[PDB]
Amino acid sequence: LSEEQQHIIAILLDAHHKTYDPTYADFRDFRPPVSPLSMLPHLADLVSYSIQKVIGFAKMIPGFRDLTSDDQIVLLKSSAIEVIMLRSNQSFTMDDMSWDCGSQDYKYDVTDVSKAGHTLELIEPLIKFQVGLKKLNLHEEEHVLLMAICIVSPDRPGVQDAKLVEAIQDRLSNTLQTYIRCRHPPPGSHQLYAKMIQKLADLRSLNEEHSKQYRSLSFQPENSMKLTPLVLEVFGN
């Protein structure tokens, strides 16, 4: 762990602390939770809010601001839903397979999230993905590095300067690998890097299944009507 690597980690920890609230206070300011589409307005509000927080986190990733605004846009567009699913793991509880932002009012289980016009083809893998990530028992240092590596990914469509994105990502990857060796207890560290990258692969797949269902959902104007302007700009019209 160089000085540079320690800086990267500390910056990403504070960025996350500044941009994620598992008390979910602002969820009062959403359309309230409540057909198999009753939760769409509330959960479209939650996703829309959460995208703003991902952009907050993203801007504090070292080297991110050195990218063009074009590259920044496309990285956020493709990563947003993944980072939202990924960061939600901290509020996920295997006690009853729910995301429990403190209060019953803002406690979301399989029944809640199943009522926003997405089918279990998306929901079941999303819940299994949370269970899998809980089972890795990641350090928050590994959590926030995985979020940054998720965002700054040179294999995302529309990337102009892939070499610069790859450079940022390698520095993040090296930092994560070095952290796991120097700081993650063996045998927990065994192929942990590899299990983490697999989790990124599970996010890409959840991403494309979210895309397909959103493409469908959104082609119905009574549904697009319940979305937000930001959700329409990011996921498409």
């Binding site: 952009i55 846009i73 956020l76 930001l230 700009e233 990011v234």
Partner: peptide, 10 residues
């Protein structure tokens, strides 16, 4: 073609 993303970036 992403004015709201552009605004939240800046």
């Amino acid at each position: 073609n992403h004015p709201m993303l552009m605004n939240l970036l800046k």
